[PDB]
Every structure is written in C-alpha cells, then in structure tokens.
Amino acid sequence: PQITLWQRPLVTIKIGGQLKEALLDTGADDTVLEEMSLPGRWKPKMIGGIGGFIKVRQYDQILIEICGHKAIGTVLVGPTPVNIIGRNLLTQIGCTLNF
Amino acid sequence: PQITLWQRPLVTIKIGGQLKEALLDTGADDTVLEEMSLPGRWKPKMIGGIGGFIKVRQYDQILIEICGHKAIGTVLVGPTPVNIIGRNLLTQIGCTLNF
Ligand SMILES: O=S(=O)(c1ccccc1)N(Cc1ccccc1)[C@H]1CNC[C@@H]1N(Cc1ccccc1)S(=O)(=O)c1ccccc1
Ligand SMILES: [Cl-]
Ligand SMILES: [Cl-]
Ligand SMILES: [Cl-]
C-alpha cells in the first residue's frame, strides 16, 4: 500500500493471537506495545522521549503480522500511551519513506 | 527520494538560514525542534510523548527546507530528544509510507 500522512498511519496487527491497532512510526527505533503477555524470556529496558522514560519488557524473536505481512523481531511491552511499530519491524515488511 | 529504515531516517533541514539534522517521524503529529530562536509571536501547545505531556512553544507559518524541499508551516520548539519533522510538514513535501 501507499499510506498517506494526512492522518496517523494506523494499521491492524496480529500478535500473540490478538488483533491490535498500531502506529507505523519511522522515528521509533523499536516496536512498543501496551501491556500484554508474550511467550519466552524477557529482560528489562528503558525507553524515553518527550515527557521522560518508561520501563518495558523486551521479548526477542516474536512473530507478528502487519497488514498481511509476516515478520519476526523484538517487541517491547509496557505502559506506552500508543501501540508503535518501529523501524526494527518496518524494515522487515519493506516499508520506505517516499517523496 | 526513497528512504529505507535500517538506520534512523535523518536528513538535513534549513531554518533561519542554518543547517540542522532532523529525524523524519511518521509517529509525530507535529514538527518539534530543539531550543532555537524563531521570529514572531508564539502560542502554547501541549504535546504527548512516550512519558507524558509537556508544554512547548508554537510558531506558525515558518519557512523551513527539508531535504531541499520548501515548506512553510507550524514549528514547535521544546526539549525534544532530537529535531523531529512530523506529519504536518511531511505532508507538505509529499511524503508517504510504502510497502
Ligand atoms: O519524543 S517523542 O515521544 C515525540 C516527539 C515529537 C512529537 C511527539 C512525540 N518521540 C520522538 C523520539 C523519541 C526518542 C528517540 C527518537 C525520537 C516519539 C515519536 N515517534 C517516535 C517516538 N515514540 C513513539 C511515539 C510516542 C508518543 C506519541 C506517538 C509516538 S517513543 O514511544 O518515544 C519510542 C522511543 C524509543 C523507542 C520506541 C518508541
Ligand atoms: Cl529486532
Ligand atoms: Cl531494503
Ligand atoms: Cl503546519
């Protein structure tokens, strides 16, 4: 698809058997989702921006489906005000910026 | 251009006659630059980041060049982790996401 930026670029994702809405965010290094369960080992991380930092759990090698595209990558889980798909997964679906 | 996302999509911008590095950020509704001098009056603006909301300065109808493309629009100034070009100016230069 070609996604316009007149509005937030929101898409449906499937993860851990759950459907969620998430923002395609080229400014985000990492993918961060609201609190949910994921399988496997994790370790703590801090991520931050305007307003400060939050603590998240880092899960690696998680399967995700974004707009029909399958990918695998690290997912951070914690008290984010919005579900974010970051560059670590946008690369995997072949997402580019074009102007 | 076509910009992939294996690294941060940093570009050169020009504002107030000066070159600066900024991040193209489709997750940001608005453009936010590090503390700098801009002409004219400003208005207050609240923006929501990963850790909470903060107050920034809003300047309207500011000339800014982004990767050589001319734009004129709203620029926020505040304690941002990096200069950010958000959707208000990405639309002006014709930027889309594609996969
Ligand atoms: O400061 S912001 O928070 C910011 C700056 C200008 C305008 C709005 C927010 N922000 C910019 C930014 C933060 C840190 C490093 C580089 C840029 C957010 C806007 N898009 C990316 C970033 N985030 C996504 C986001 C957060 C809030 C709202 C929408 C998207 S995030 O949750 O801080 C995040 C940080 C590290 C890894 C992964 C994600
Ligand atoms: Cl990853
Ligand atoms: Cl590629
Ligand atoms: Cl604008």
The sign of the dihedral angle between the CA atoms of B20, B4, A70, A3 is positive
Any atom of ligand 1 within 6 Å of the Cβ of B25 = yes
Would you call A25 helix, strand, or coil by DSSP? coil
| Cα A68 from Cα B34, distance rounded (Å) | 38
Residue B29 CA to ligand 1 centre (angstroms): 11
Q: What SS3 class is residue A2? A: strand
| Token couple for B15 | 């504002």
Resolution in angstroms for this experimental structure? 1.5
Distance between CA atoms of residues B50 and A97, nearest Å: 23
Mutation pick from B5, B6, B89 vs chain A, by most beta carbons of A within 10 Å, is: B5
- Written as six digits, the tokens of B85 are 């070009």
Residue B36's domain comprises 1-99
Q: Is B30 in the pocket of ligand 1 (CB under 6 A)?
A: yes
What CA–CA distance (Å, rounded) separates A4 from A24? 11
Beta-carbon-side half-sphere exposure of residue B36 (alpha carbons within 13 Å): 21
Number of domains in chain B: 1
Q: How far is residue A57 CA from its own chain's centroid?
A: 13
Residue of chain A with shortest Cα separation from B32: A50
How far, in Å, CA of A21 to CA of A13, rounded?
Answer: 6
Tokens standing for residue B82: 């990096």
Residue nearest ligand 1's atom 3 by CA: B49
Q: What's B30's domain CATH number?
A: 2.40.70.10
* Beta partners for residue B64, in sequence order: B71
Report strand pairing: A32-33 vs A69-77.
parallel
Burial classification of residue A51, based on how many CB atoms lie within 10 Å of its CB (0-12 exposed, 13-18 middle, 19 or more buried):
middle
Strand order in the sheet with B96-98: A2-3, B96-98, A96-98, B2-3
First to last CA, chain B: 15
DSSP one-letter string for chain B: -EE-SSS--EEEEEETTEEEEEEE-TT-SS-EE-S---SS--EEEEEEETTEEEEEEEEEEEEEEETTEEEEEEEEES--SS-EE-HHHHHHTT-EEE-
Per DSSP bridges, beta strands A96-98 and B43-49 are unpaired
User: B54 near B39, Cβ under 8 Å?
Assistant: no
For A32-72, the three-class secondary structure string (H helix, E strand, C coil) is EECCCCCCCCEEEEEEEECCEEEEEEEEEEEEEEECCEEEE
